[model samples]
Target: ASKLRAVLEKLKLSRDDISTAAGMVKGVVDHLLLRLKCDSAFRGVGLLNTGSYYEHVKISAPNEFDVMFKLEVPRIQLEEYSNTRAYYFVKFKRNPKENPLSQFLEGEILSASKMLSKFRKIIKEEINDIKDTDVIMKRKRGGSPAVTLLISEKISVDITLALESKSSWPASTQEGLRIQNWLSAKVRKQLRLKPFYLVPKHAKEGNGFQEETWRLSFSHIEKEILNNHGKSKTCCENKEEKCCRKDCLKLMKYLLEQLKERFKDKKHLDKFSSYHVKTAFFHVCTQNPQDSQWDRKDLGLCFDNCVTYFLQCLRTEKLENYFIPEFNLFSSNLIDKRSKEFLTKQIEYERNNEFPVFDE
Candidate 1:
């Protein structure tokens, strides 16, 4: 237990590092967007900083960033790009206006590949014009949706373009975000009323059509929940009942990362990500919503319970997306059986032996 306590202390980001990273990231985004938002095909409404660092759960460093650019469109229809309801084919209900992005249409479907192709062109051209010599656009990684920018000190930003819709939440989310017990009916209704976002990201091992598929994004929704996570208003704000929810999330994420780096060449951890951990944490939140359930005083138990929940999910091979219950985060395409078994075995071994990875 002292190990967890020690690890928690070590996981903290220096206040100076966080503020400095924030300044650099914002400066880079602001400068680049001045040109991007002004482009004819890139009429973005705004940007959303959506990631663990912004959520205050990031461990070790403040280098990775996830930011979404909002693009407004007329009311549109969404058809599942595949069996998964999370990915959708965006279609205008009627003849689209002479929008700059209209040229990107493949028949009635918006082609993410075409739009991204042009997006990258403009971004590439503009980043060259960026005044800073240290900031550079990294080469694209396969199947990634963002235009990543690398800065000095190992800081990297993933910039994703998201479509904003004013319509109500999609029907697929009916059973998702089961926050009624965790938050409240009134609170849930309020969030549902807000606009939802969709990011352009295709499925793996897909046909050409799937290359243009877009997936629903609840990054903003998740951000909101993380900000107001406690059952009571005063849960984390110098209140008597301080919660350990964020602390537990950071530890679990760090543990997973340790396993990953330890077995870097094993390829078993390739499909797993921090989002998987975040989703499982959300599920556990619903099952245990009381303020007393995550008492800061018992951080070790809280963190242990978080790990226990994650191990249970790995064994079941079914970690449901918190916002899209039908989409399994650990589906066959996303993770293979051998990889799952290997990771699960490593997790159990670490658990039994007191997480020697953390001690390292």
Candidate 2:
């Protein structure tokens, strides 16, 4: 138990590291917001701190941050392009004479590609005049929604342009949010009230996916649920006993990171990422559905259970998206029998060996 607690403590971010990360992030975000505030096309865009940083599960060096520079569009029609029900084509209603985003529209439909191109341009121009020697704009990568910026040679901040909508969720997701059994029906109702976001992400052509399709984002809900995860209201509260849920998640995340680094077959493992582990963690929590199952003293047992569940999914090659089950987190092209078998073996080795992956 002492050794396990030490391992978790080591995974936590140090106070100085957190503060240093904060300063680096604040510098870039402040610069971008100040420059974009005056631009008419990006007037309503606001920053939403997201990803591992905001989710409180970030480990190691604070080198990457995800900030959604979301532009809240009003009265827009959302058309789902694929059967997944998570990708959409956005259309404007009652076009305004001085539409800030009109230039990015292909006929009446908004082009995510066009909008992101201009956003990248704006960011490059803004950073060019900045006196800061450490911060510089990175070359845009193809098919990425973010405009990457490097800070102090190592840290990268991804500023993603997201079009947000307050419309009801697509029909495909109606049966998915099975959290009411754990978090109650009212909490589910409240989460539905929050707006969903769409980033400029498109899958391969044909089968209902188009070139400029936007992928739906439920990051806000994800962050909220992770932050307050518990059947009991005092899950991680100051007055209550700390649950082992987050600890298990952290260890799982760390384990995946190490596996990716050490895996001999690089090509197959490239498709695997931390998000898969995260999704599995959420699924495991819902399945367990009890605070006692994740008691802090039982962290090792809980972590093993979580890991076992993830391994089972890997063997079957089907990790469903928490919100959109149709959209398999483990796509067919990403994982195969060889990789699944390899993962299963590797995970079992770590489980039996007390996870030497964390030592280094």
Candidate 3:
């Protein structure tokens, strides 16, 4: 039997218990979601996997117009770039000489954890009974993946704003808008360029909870999205008029084939080692009003994220040889911290003892 099956048997957890465990897991992820500012939190969810497993998460827009992939994998290839996914993949150019990932993704990974703590504290305020917080990161098929579980009943939740922008500053719902503003102001101040010219998409609107997208200014940014982001979206696209994991996996496999062709003559690396790729975590959430089929406030942002995770494997080439970005296995605490807080406050909420799963 699989380790999970063993755990189920040993713990004597009934299917109901497993269901409860799943609910607990969701509670934690939802709680952590509260901490993120803009799209970071939107693309965010509390994760629980084996301690040594590679955990990948992807967040895509409703139309998948905007997307972000968060990877937490192992450090086997190069420890120098292992701790942070930001170190590679993200870059101004595919400058092989100057580590491309460090420029942007490095900043994103750092910011993601920081935001998790902020929300965790809010949840913690309501409940203090959580005895132990643990995370399991699965390694090989025989082992478990990294996952964090907070032993607590109290759950609370709240929504924050996010903005969409290029610079990796404070993340927010209006992240793009804030980013546009910040970029516009900086360009107008430093470069003496008109705000319109500097950031075309940035409008006068301040900030609020909304989907984030970047209005490309240069050829490279657009290329990056298409070459990188577009590839990711297609990473899970189905050729048939249907969407499912099988097609997503096939797409990833197809991408890998392309990588093999690109690196056909490259030295010092095998096909997998030569091409590094990562899929963004699918940040699933309900839009404004939060009402959805799940009929729950938390499910308001009902998140289903397998596609992104699968795409990440394609991003890094999956142990072919090169190190793209690894999913975080050790930082499960950050997720649990945020979830516990959300659950606590939710239970203590005075107005209603019982709340809807998705509130509109």
Candidate 4:
């Protein structure tokens, strides 16, 4: 047969040596056929990409890749998000619609649609071990505020890990969504949380609601329009309420401290039976256009004092090491190419169905 002949030719063997070569070929063929048929017990969790497939093949051949993992190992839920929605607090002299987070997070989600394309890589990287597939909720759901989970091998063991996107990708909405989209199933499930834009605490006065807005779920529709509520108090723009490096540092320091303190509550461990948050970081962008050296000065001061403040809290017992902090950007290279392609195709597919422009 052509298959046997091809193997013999590659091995530089003759017909007399065909028996050994044929046996070797049969062994390889059987292993490969089994690998091709193997299924991940959890359905969609594991490495399934070209480079890893070939690499795993070379490592697994004669033995087999499917046999390497215990297919029967029970699949467990390993991730949690306490609030369905992620909260960010911003103060503005004037609301600039084109601010960085707004622009970046939007693009970030769109790019994350490619996770399914490199499904194999997810397995190979052992990303499955880390529980990340949870949704963020901006509003309360019935009696419960939106909830997230701690993804771990032991569903009963409550723990979660957090990593910040690196600085190189500042204004990285794509980075956040890359992680949010790839790990979480809700995207394919057609679910999304409303984006709640939380303004400075003082932005809320007598009305009960703050001077912020929420972009309703996946419909990408705006819900609350930004009301023309002027800051009852003044800001540095007028020199009356001087917004300086000190104020910025103070806010970052306070938020980090509050987060550290909140993580230590015994209830999170006793009632929830979960302890240990991996890591957290703050993203910062200065608004001063004239401060050409804003990055070096503002960011440096921001991180330095914030670190100093947290260390102080740690020493005074106001905080514990449970929650740690880093300073980084909004997005990074972690955004996979497949997500970008898939999201693009998804848009086209949706447009074709939902809009009439394509009928022509």
By TM-score, is 1 or 2 better? 1
How many clashing residue pairs, candidate 1?
0
Superposed by TM-score, candidate 3 places the C-alpha of residue 168 at a distance from the truth, in angstroms, of 19
Candidate 1 versus the native: TM-score? 0.95
What TM-score number comes out for model 4? 0.18
Q: Please give the clash total of every predicted structure, in order.
A: 0, 0, 94, 30
Backbone clashes in candidate 2 total 0
Candidate 2, residues 10-95: lDDT per residue as tens digits? Answer: 77788888898789878778888888878888888899988888988887767789899999888778788857577788898886
The C-alpha RMSD of each candidate to the native structure, in angstroms, is: 1.7, 2.4, 21.5, 26.6
Candidate 4 local lDDT, 288-333, one digit each (tens): 2122222322444444434444333323323221111111111122
lDDT of each: 0.84, 0.82, 0.25, 0.24
TM-score to native of every candidate shown: 0.95, 0.93, 0.22, 0.18
Question: Model 1 over residues 67-98: C-alpha lDDT tens digits?
Answer: 98788876677887657778888888777556
Worst 10 residues of 3 by lDDT: 57-66
Model 1: CA > 4 A from native: 140-142, 205-209
Q: After superposition, how far is residue 13 of candidate 4 from its true place, in Å?
A: 48
Q: Which residue runs does candidate 3 get wrong by more than 4 Å? A: 1-14, 35-147, 152-360
| Candidate order by decreasing lDDT | 1, 2, 3, 4
